[PDB]
Amino acid sequence: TKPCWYWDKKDLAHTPSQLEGLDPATEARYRREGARFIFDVGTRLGLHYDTLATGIIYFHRFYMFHSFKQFPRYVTGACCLFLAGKVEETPKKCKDIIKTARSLLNDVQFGQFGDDPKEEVMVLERILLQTIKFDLQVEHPYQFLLKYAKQLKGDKNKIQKLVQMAWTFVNDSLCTTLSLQWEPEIIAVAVMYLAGRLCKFEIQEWTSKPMYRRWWEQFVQDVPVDVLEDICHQILDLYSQGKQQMPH
Amino acid sequence: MSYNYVVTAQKPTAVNGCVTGHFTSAEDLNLLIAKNTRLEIYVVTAEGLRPVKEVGMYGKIAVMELFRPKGESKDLLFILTAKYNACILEYKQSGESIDIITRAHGNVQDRIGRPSETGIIGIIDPECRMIGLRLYDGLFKVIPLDRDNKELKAFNIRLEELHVIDVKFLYGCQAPTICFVYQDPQGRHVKTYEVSLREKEFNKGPWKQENVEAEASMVIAVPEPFGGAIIIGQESITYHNGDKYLAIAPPIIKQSTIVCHNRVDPNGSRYLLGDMEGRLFMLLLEKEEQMDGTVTLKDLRVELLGETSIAECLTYLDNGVVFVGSRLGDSQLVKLNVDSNEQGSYVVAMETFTNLGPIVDMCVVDLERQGQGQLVTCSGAFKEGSLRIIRNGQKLHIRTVPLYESPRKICYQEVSQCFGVLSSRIEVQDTSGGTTALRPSASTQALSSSVSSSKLFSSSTAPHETSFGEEVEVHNLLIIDQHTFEVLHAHQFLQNEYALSLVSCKLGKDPNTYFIVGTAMVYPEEAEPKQGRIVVFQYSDGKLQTVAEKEVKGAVYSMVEFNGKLLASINSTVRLYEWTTEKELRTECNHYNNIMALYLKTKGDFILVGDLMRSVLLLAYKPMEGNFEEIARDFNPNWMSAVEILDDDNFLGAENAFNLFVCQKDSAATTDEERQHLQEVGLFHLGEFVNVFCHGSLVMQNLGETSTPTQGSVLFGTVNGMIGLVTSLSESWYNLLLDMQNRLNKVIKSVGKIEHSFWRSFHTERKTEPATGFIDGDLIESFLDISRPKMQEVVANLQYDDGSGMKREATADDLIKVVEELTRIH
């Protein structure tokens, strides 16, 4: 019926990119760049946050089936965003995405688009659709972060701080392979869990069951803490590696 | 775009209705006969009828009634067309000049309504206060007959009884009263209402509802001496009037369904009744006068008088003369005698009026080698079935070959100097367990005969119970000589086998010429036939010999020879068979994208397929590959009745709504999709139901005929006997004739003031479109009949195009020559 779009961390050692001699750090960097490119291009175009995420998810899934050495990331990214716009009903013309991509990319980077940027992108749409197995509907942590937050009752300022901090963590998780490891529902919980620890908030008190120390089990069933910690660790690692610090 | 021309070669002959009254003068008794779109007016004489006037209306005549409102010297005529155009007409004569006056007119169509099952019904009050119309289920429309209602404005009264069978205005009521039979889940009932023009609604009726026969068909309004109504059914006749109820159930009427009634005696003592087998009965109202001075109905009696043609309408004239208006056979004038003849009959035929009847099929064949061509038509049904040989000679010469059974298909085989004709006769289950024919007919009077011995369906194991009295069809192939038209041979097909298709041709390398018949096994239980036979016959030395049989899984609706191969349509499938050296049919290629492949036509390696509901598909045989290819389809949905190929690009179709359309290949190779789309370029409401298209022309060809502007010749036969002709035009000739039509329509006065453009507009219950690509030749040919002042008025400011002179002014004499040349194509 529907395809499986989630892998185990150990499996990422065997992507086409890895097996063509690309080392783990480089593929990670290539993904951070492609994601941040999709995010920046669409943000310049004024695109909804779901549209950016959908393009990023297409992008991440794509390179589970292909190698970065044979498919330029910035072309793939532009193609993903182009399709995402049509899927999420926030369409953009391919020429405008190229225009924005050129504004944001240097001369070396834009060389990936070759002599005819639009053609390279439009041609790729065929492979993208076949690669993502025409499974176009994608759910994102954002909707669950809001759906679950709406069930919290308490100080508006204390919660709203939780939501925004978690929202920032969601935007940051788009540069990682978490989208390929855990369903969006778990991600939304993980970012709520992380923000709570950082803000020293005890979320259970706001839940309908205030003695249920496992506050997430009422939103997402069958999630061990280890999963949430694994997700938190990866998100925090991104901040430790970068010069940026936790939003707080 | 495509340009075509359509003319009538023979006007409709079937009688759709007939009434008697004082229409032309308050003194003379007139018989008005209605044929589809044609009104014939006669004056009754002691010998017969004197014709006085014939008008054509731009509409199909559905209602025709004569009424005389207080203050009028003579009867007025009400007519309602099937397109809901209503009008009141008056006959006016000034010396030698006869004209028909339109006193009132309008369109009574409702925006929202469901057309009734039993069709449009129109009745007029005995006091001529209002016209009752039953157009839609659950609604009764009233046109009040006031002097000021020149537009025939009307209102609807809500009617609780949704399924009405028949309704009539009653005599002898204090207020306008309607008596009608209706059907609901509990059976059929008779009920009455009063119509109040002041309140514009129904009031309680004079007498209560009564439960009536399940198949109560007709309501007869009895006149003032008796009052009340008579209800005719299948087995019983009943009289109703308040507390009075009489019912007679003679066994004779049960045998055949009674379809038409008329009043002989103005007081209501005697009524005439006719049934589908042609028997004519006299219904007698036996009077009993009480000492009170009042008159009551004592009893009802039915007496058989004799046999007439199957009659759509009967009307008593005077003396013993009755006009038998027949839609399935020839109409008649018959005299009723007081004394029976030596055979026991009181009916003796006086005159016979030719009715080409339903033209199920026809072929054009040159019997005398003159090059003129003759049209042999399968005409009539049941006892009226006949073969009609028609030739041009200024009137058409028609010869009739009586068959006394229903003819279905005809095809000519020159090698054998004979015709092959498919026919069916009605037999009835009898006490022997078999069936007995009601009368001898062509299939039983053949010189030599044969009965099918095929064992293909012999295994059966499917029970089909038979009840005594039930009807069955028995199908035959008739071999008929082309000179004597004598039935030489008749082959009876299997029990429950219907013959649907017939061809005469040679196949493959076989030098023998065969009759080939496609059949279907028809059982009442099945929705669609699932068994069938393709049979190859050889007529040799006075005997028909079966050469081969091919079993199919469906009905062989249509067959046509295809370059030495046999092209047959079996239900959805369209199949091509090869004829092997072993004299057996061998399948080659099939096409399945059809719902019901009813009709087939071929030109070269191209095939035109007609579907029950998907219009037409252009197929092609690809010899390099040995299979079919879909060239182009008409995606617009149409119910087909007949199709024909005009040329390699234009295709002609006939709809069940009495419309004609012409499809063409879009001739644009830009996209393959454009080529695959057949664009309807011609739309035209013919007003007739076309069953057969046939290439050919009856006009004699001496090789000297001035080459007419029209090119091509397709004849078609219709259900009402009308024969028409379709031909193509050049763009220049079309524009000239089309511009002329628009000029003629402003000049010519229409009966009922019906707009010509509306009449010819494509019309389905769902859609109405303006006509396109068709020239109404009957309108063009009327230019020669309008007065000289009108002729010159028409030609004013008329310019020519694309000719020897780009722009040229036309004169009335110039057009007289052009139209006269157009009248020479038929």
């Binding site: 499974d135 | 029950l612 509901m613």
Partner: protein, 325 residues
């Protein structure tokens, strides 16, 4: 696996013929070589390369893989033309969307005049359509192109909604700018004629009500060629748009611009007096001018007309027979 769409080739289907022309491509009837199941194949051509894969097809793929209902057409898979080897750029072959073949479409049955609908037949039909619409409306998807041609019917009496090319999600909390002119004029609601642009799911209801009346009359209720003429026809039957019946009508862009000849009174019950009372009440509510007062899909299912209809008894309609030829 069954989920890896876009790879299997169209070779696996034997093409029977072209059953219609679709909006993004032509639609073919085909038979699966492996199973023998009849399918309807819809062709999507990206060769134009103006905007790539058509969004209309993207909508249908996105939505129909989410919607699973007896009265909603199922997309079985997506197959492709033999693609070029090693040359992905050169390949211009188009993909085909696979569906189940339905024996007829309502426009074809009604147009031929061959189909006859009894009350019970109309009950089974409308109940299936409204159940499908309720499922879709509960999922917050709007069809936006309800027409007799988009109702496919199997000879078994099963109804399925079919063309989801214009379908989009509806957000009650966030009003969004939408395509004003979505439904075909004959089935378009009065609100869109006046150009709401922020339409409710009730636009689909109005269309289905128009179908309800067309099944009784066998003729489309409101047939016009111009948007103003349609408002006139609707106004004569349903009443002229006025603030009393449509308080917010004054906010609609074209209310002052597009006026009917008169302020007509409502005549629906009078002109449809032949319709059964249980159904006439459904028509009155479905054909309500004010979208906020127009009944919902669930409400129609909970009507005297359709509530007690049992879907087990499909009661197949009187479909063309051999005798009708």
């Amino acid at each position: 696996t069954e989920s890896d769409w876009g790879k299997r080739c169209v070779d696996k289907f034997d093409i029977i013929g072209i059953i219609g022309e679709g909006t993004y491509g032509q639609v073919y009837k085909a038979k699966d070589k492996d199973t023998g199941e009849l399918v309807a194949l819809k062709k999507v051509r990206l060769d134009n390369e103006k905007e790539g894969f058509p969004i209309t097809a993207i909508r249908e793929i996105k939505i129909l893989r989410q919607l699973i209902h007896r009265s909603v057409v199922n997309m079985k898979e997506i197959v492709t033309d033999k693609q070029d080897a090693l040359d992905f750029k050169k390949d211009k072959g188009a993909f085909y969307l696979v569906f189940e073949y339905m024996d007829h479409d309502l426009m074809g049955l009604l147009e031929s005049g061959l189909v006859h609908f009894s009350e019970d037949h109309i009950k089974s039909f409308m109940k299936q359509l409204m159940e499908g619409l309720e499922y879709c409306h509960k999922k917050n998807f709007l069809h936006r192109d309800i027409k007799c041609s988009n109702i496919l019917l199997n000879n078994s009496g099963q109804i399925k909604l079919a063309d989801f090319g214009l379908a989009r999600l509806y957000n009650s909390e966030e009003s969004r700018p939408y395509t004003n002119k979505v439904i075909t004029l004959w089935y378009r609601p009065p609100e869109l004629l006046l150009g709401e642009e922020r339409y409710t799911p009730a636009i689909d209801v109005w269309s289905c009500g128009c179908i309800l009346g067309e099944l009784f009359t066998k003729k489309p209720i409101f047939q016009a060629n111009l948007e103003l003429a349609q408002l006139e026809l609707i106004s004569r039957l349903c009443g002229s748009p006025c603030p009393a019946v449509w308080p917010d009508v004054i906010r609609l862009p074209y209310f002052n611009t597009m006026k009917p000849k008169k302020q007509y009174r409502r005549r629906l019950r009078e002109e449809f007096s032949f319709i059964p009372s249980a159904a006439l009440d459904l028509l009155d509510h479905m054909l309500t001018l004010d979208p906020s007062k127009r009944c919902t899909a669930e409400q129609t299912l909970q009507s005297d007309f359709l509530k007690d209809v049992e879907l087990s008894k499909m009661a197949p309609p009187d479909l063309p027979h051999w005798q009708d030829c």
